Amino acid sequence: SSNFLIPNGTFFVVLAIFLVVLAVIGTFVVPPILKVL
Amino acid sequence: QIEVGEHHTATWLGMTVNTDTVLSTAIAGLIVIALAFYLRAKVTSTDVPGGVQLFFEAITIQMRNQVESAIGMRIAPFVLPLAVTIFVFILISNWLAVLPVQYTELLKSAAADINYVLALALFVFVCYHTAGIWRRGGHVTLLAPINLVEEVAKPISLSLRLFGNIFAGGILVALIALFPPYIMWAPNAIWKAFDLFVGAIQAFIFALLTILYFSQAMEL
Amino acid sequence: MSTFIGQLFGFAVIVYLVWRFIVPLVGRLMSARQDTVRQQLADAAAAADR
Amino acid sequence: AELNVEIVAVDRNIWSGTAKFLFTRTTVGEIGILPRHIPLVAQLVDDAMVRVEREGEKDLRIAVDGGFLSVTEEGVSILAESAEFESEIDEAAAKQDSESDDPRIAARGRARLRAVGAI
Amino acid sequence: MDPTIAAGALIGGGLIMAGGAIGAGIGDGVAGNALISGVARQPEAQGRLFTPFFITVGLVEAAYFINLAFMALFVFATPVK
Amino acid sequence: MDPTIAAGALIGGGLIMAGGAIGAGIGDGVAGNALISGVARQPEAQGRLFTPFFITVGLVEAAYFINLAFMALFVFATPVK
Amino acid sequence: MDPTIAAGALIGGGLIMAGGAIGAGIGDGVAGNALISGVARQPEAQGRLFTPFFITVGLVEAAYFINLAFMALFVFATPVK
Amino acid sequence: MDPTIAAGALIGGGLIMAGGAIGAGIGDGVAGNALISGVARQPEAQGRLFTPFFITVGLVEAAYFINLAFMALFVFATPVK
Amino acid sequence: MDPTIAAGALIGGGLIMAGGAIGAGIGDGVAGNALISGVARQPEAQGRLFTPFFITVGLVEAAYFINLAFMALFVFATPVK
Amino acid sequence: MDPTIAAGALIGGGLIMAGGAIGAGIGDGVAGNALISGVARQPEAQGRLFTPFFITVGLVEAAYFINLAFMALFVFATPVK
Amino acid sequence: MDPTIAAGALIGGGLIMAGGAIGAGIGDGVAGNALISGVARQPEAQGRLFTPFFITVGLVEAAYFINLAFMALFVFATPVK
Amino acid sequence: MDPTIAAGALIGGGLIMAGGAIGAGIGDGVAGNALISGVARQPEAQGRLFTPFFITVGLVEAAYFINLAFMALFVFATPVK
Amino acid sequence: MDPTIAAGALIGGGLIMAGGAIGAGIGDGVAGNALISGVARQPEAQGRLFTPFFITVGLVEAAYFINLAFMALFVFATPVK
Numbered sequence A: 001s002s003n004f005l006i007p008n009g010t011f012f013v014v015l016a017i018f019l020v021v022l023a024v025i026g027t028f029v030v031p032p033i034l035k036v037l
Numbered sequence B: 001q002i003e004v005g006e007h008h009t010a011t012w013l014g015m016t017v018n019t020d021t022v023l024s025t026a027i028a029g030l031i032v033i034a035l036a037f038y039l040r041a042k043v044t045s046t047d048v049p050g051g052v053q054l055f056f057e058a059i060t061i062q063m064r065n066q067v068e069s070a071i072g073m074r075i076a077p078f079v080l081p082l083a084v085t086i087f088v089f090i091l092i093s094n095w096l097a098v099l100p101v102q103y104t105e106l107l108k109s110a111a112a113d114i115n116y117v118l119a120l121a122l123f124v125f126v127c128y129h130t131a132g133i134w135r136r137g138g139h140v141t142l143l144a145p146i147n148l149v150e151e152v153a154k155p156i157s158l159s160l161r162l163f164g165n166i167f168a169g170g171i172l173v174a175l176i177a178l179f180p181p182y183i184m185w186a187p188n189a190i191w192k193a194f195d196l197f198v199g200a201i202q203a204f205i206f207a208l209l210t211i212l213y214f215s216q217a218m219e220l
Numbered sequence C: 001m002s003t004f005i006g007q008l009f010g011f012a013v014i015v016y017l018v019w020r021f022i023v024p025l026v027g028r029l030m031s032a033r034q035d036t037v038r039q040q041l042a043d044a045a046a047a048a049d050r
Numbered sequence D: 001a002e003l004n005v006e007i008v009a010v011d012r013n014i015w016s017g018t019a020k021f022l023f024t025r026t027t028v029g030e031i032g033i034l035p036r037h038i039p040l041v042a043q044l045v046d047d048a049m050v051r052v053e054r055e056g057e058k059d060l061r062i063a064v065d066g067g068f069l070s071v072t073e074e075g076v077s078i079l080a081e082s083a084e085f086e087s088e089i090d091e092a093a094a095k096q097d098s099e100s101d102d103p104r105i106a107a108r109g110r111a112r113l114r115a116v117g118a119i
Numbered sequence E, F, G, H, I, J, K, L, M: 001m002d003p004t005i006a007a008g009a010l011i012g013g014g015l016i017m018a019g020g021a022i023g024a025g026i027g028d029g030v031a032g033n034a035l036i037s038g039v040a041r042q043p044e045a046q047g048r049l050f051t052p053f054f055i056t057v058g059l060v061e062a063a064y065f066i067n068l069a070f071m072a073l074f075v076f077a078t079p080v081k
Ligand SMILES: COc1cc([C@](O)(CCN(C)C)[C@@H](c2cc3cc(Br)ccc3nc2OC)c2cccc(OC)c2F)cc(OC)n1
Pocket: B190, B191, B194, F024, F058, F061, F062, F064, F065, F068, G059, G062, G063, G066
């Protein structure tokens, strides 16, 4: 009975997950593969 | 009948957060960082490379070609990692929807909720705005208002398609359920086939549009 | 509840077709890239010993 | 079957054989000729390259200077004020000459550079 | 009453799915018409022609699928009652 | 009452299939236009020209088939009733 | 009453045959326009240009016939009833 | 009231012709635009360009005529009455 | 009774004339475009370019005129009474 | 009673003004597109290009004017009453 | 009653303005396309290209303005009342 | 009773904005096509190609803005009431 | 009563979502048709072609989303009620 197009708090949850995954790749992969090539 | 994309939820800082769509994005993120560990450990340089190594390397050289085609890596290299995650983090975020769970299922993709794509797009928004301010502090002045909606439409557009392109799947997976199970498999099969194409294409265009918006932000 | 039956059956047929079309050719392409880079590093060793 | 390529310079038949594919670059963009193809006449770009691809060998690469292109029923025919193969271009002078200010000689340099794989 | 609104949902919503398919279907034609032709001009350019193709498609199909999203918001979760 | 939502669903399914038909017809037309042109240009490229063809057509047919499915939702499994 | 459904099939059905004809009518045009030019450029191509042509038309005509069928299903079956 | 059916047949049938007119009208233009060009390019080919032309037209006009037929069936017969 | 059928006849005639107008206008435009292009390319060709032109325009204008005819049959002589 | 026919007068007539305007506005835009092209390709030919052009536009504008006339005949004359 | 005539007049004015908008927009687009192309071909030709351009636009724009006029005559001074 | 005039104004604004969006979108598309083609053909022309372009788009966008204006004039300050 | 306005929003607002979806999905195609072709002819031009591309798209998408704005305003915040 609720509208689904409404912003929610999961915004910040997935924001944090994405930020930590961004940091993970930036420290772990890009520079390694870049220097490998 | 068919339910709309409702959710289970829970309150943790006064505001509510959907119970699911956190589990799925969690699975996606952990699989991404897990294959990142796999590659960092098995990164080969001298001998024949593994599948995941060549995979990531092709992705990153594609993104690299794009970025230095737009903005040289010497000036803004950080756009390259930010790009690839936007690709890969999103790619799996859709792929996991192929495996059968339904019976209503909680294994629908993370984009099926608007707030996911909202967070990603607004993050890209503030990132390229910080890029623009970092350089100095359109092509025709008199189109300021379009360039005004340029301010607003980019985070909107980038978000909305990424919702819609995915949300339709989140609906169709239910719709074919209303057909008899002994004949429903074939349209289900075709649609499952097209799911991968549309997910990949949408992630790809999202990443490329991120790159191009960064290029347009840091002009001069 | 036979919706599970239809969904699992669809997954089976699509993974069958995946093993029919997609994975052979993508494995071929990745193995071709592997072959090329291995040949390049072998010629590197050859240049070194020469 | 295959097509017939005949590249004739202004004073000497540069090359002539049979080919599976013929890549070049007209003043209206790149183009690739295949065994059958509509009759066409087109002026190659200032610093054109011509990559012929034979069945049982490697892809011959020819730097052409001053060329025109004519595809007919029989096969392709390229004209050329000067043509230089891949196996004979000196990368040193070719690269050094590219940044010259003289248009014709710079075009020759860019062609010599494309033919050997660089640029 | 309620049924009339429901009708307005099924009619209106249908429009959103009509104007969608006209825009997408024709778009992926006028874009594909430039891909095929390209792969007919240089039969070995296909490899790169995918990067501008699948970009334009990604924009074009957007205008379709966004519509479909709102279509559900009309057909299943009518914002007015 | 049911007849009103019935007529609404019928009109909506009609609109959905009209949009789908226009989109599919003109998209396949403009794609086959480039196919015929490219096969007239390089008759040997036919075997290749199908792979950029059966993508666009493929893509286009998606935006058709979806409509078809949704048409059924409007006609045989009317949402609000 | 029931008449409100009847016209709902006659109107909607009409729509199904409107977007049908705009689909085929233009499609067969934009496809055939690429045949004539082809044949106008080399008459000996009329032999092979029918291989792509009668494919596109095929696809295009499908988009018509389905709608045709559905129009009957709307006018001679009236599903929502 | 029953006469609404008549209106449904008068409106609906109208659509069936309207679409038809946008099918032939443009569908022949886009086709004739090729003939007028082919005959301009290779005049001595006018004799043969009437073989592909009278196929495309021969198809497009069909999509018109059939529509006409059904429009008659809609108005002079009104199947659902 | 009569008023509903009268309004339906008016709207049906409007749809028929709108379809005819779009068809005739755009078909004549796309045909005259090739006419003007052929006249500009080969000036002495005009004398013959009028014979493929005045065929297509015929095939276009017929589609217009017929609709106009039926519009009369829809307005002045409503078949369903 | 009468007022609803008045509605069918303003709506239907409106449609007749709409269709024509889509047929003229694009028609002149396409036919003119050749003029602007031909004159850009061969300025020397301008004088003659106004002869075929003003043919097409004429025909095109005819499709407008007739419809315009009928618009009045719907809004001012109102045949069915 | 008058409000039903009010809704009829409002929908008629909407249709009129929508047709005018589609016509003017696509016509100006197709004409300015040829203008930009002719300017990109021969840079100096711009001066003369504004002679045919502002002709066709002049026609296209007319088909807009007239509609606009008529639209007001529909809503402010409803001819039927 | 106002609700009928309210629905009339709503559908009128919907038609106006839909027509305006179709016109403006397709006009900007067909003009940017020429712009991108000119830049890809004569790249040094990139500077001048903006003086013809921002005419057409300008004109095109007028056709939108006016509609937009009048749309609000139907919705927030309805002429008929 | 209020339902007649509610439906008036769902249809009217719904129309807005179709117009934009036809104005964007085709525009983004007609513009993209340039891009691909450019890249098919001069790959070296790719980097620069994205500059006039995302200008026109920048216009086109706007014409969509402003619509997507007003549609929302029609369905969530119906002004006249
Ligand atoms: C009676 O409804 C149809 C429908 C269809 C199609 O929808 C194509 C319609 N076009 C040709 C006008 C078709 C289809 C769906 C697709 C879906 C995706 Br997602 C991607 C590519 C697709 N490609 C397709 O074919 C090109 C299709 C659908 C279902 C079963 C089918 O098996 C019989 C089937 F063929 C054909 C048809 O023939 C009478 N009747």
